[PDB]
Structure formats: C-alpha cells, structure tokens
C-alpha cells in the first residue's frame, strides 16, 4: 500500500 | 533584500508562506491568496492530522503529483517524494493551491540537482 508513496497517472 | 524567484524558492516551504503572511511582504514576488483557497487548503490538511504518515503524505501527493504533471516536468514521483518528505506538508499544500510560480522554481532547483532521476 502506501509504502512509498504511490502516484498513476 | 528583494528575493528573487529562485533565491525565495530555495528556502523551505514554512518560510516562503510565513514571509508571504508578514504584513511586511514588501515586494516579494508572491501573488495576494485567495482566502477560500487557503481555507480548503488548511482544511485539507486538518483532515491528514493523525493518520498514519505514509497516509497523509500519499493524500497530499495525489494532488501535488497532478499539479507537478501539469508543469510539463519528467520524474514527477521522485520529486514529489523528495518534496513530501523535506517540506512542512501544510505549507507545501499552500504552495501547490496558492503559489505555483514558486513551487515550480522550487521544483526546478530539484531538477538542477538531479532529483527527478
């Protein structure tokens, strides 16, 4: 989950 | 001491907002905030307090990541990562709502530095 920090686009 | 662009960018988000909040902002180059802005910005992150970390930061990121994207810059994670993690998250959420010119300065002294690789 958020362990880095995670961004799609 | 007038700041330039760049010399105000290269200092930490808590200070570029705490100097655009001094009655004295005598010439600095920070365009007058909307108030409606800053309050659904300081709502926002009033919203983030007591989460886990890894939490508010993905929540601040989703928007800061966007808003990185939208200045045409590459390796957006990284510099987003990189600025959650050195930066007051609430006084980066203002940059990113309410003063984008000196984020994107910002972000360029980290591209200077290779930071988006």
Redesign the interface.
């Known amino acids: 989950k958020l362990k880095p920090y995670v961004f799609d686009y | 001491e007038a700041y330039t662009l760049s010399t105000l960018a290269a200092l930490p988000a808590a200070e570029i907002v705490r100097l655009a909040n001094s009655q004295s902002s005598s010439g600095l180059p920070l365009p007058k905030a909307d108030p409606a802005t800053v309050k659904a910005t300081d709502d926002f992150i009033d919203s983030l307090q007591g989460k886990?970390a890894?939490?508010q930061?993905?929540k601040l990121?989703?928007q800061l990541?966007?808003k990185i994207?939208t200045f045409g810059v590459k390796g957006?994670?990284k510099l987003?990562?990189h600025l959650?993690d050195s930066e007051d998250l609430r006084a980066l959420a203002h940059l990113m709502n309410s003063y984008e010119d000196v984020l994107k300065e910002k972000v360029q002294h980290k591209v200077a530095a290779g930071l988006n690789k």
Request: proline fraction near 7%.
């Open positions: 886990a890894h939490d930061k993905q990121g989703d990541f966007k994207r957006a994670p987003t990562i959650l």
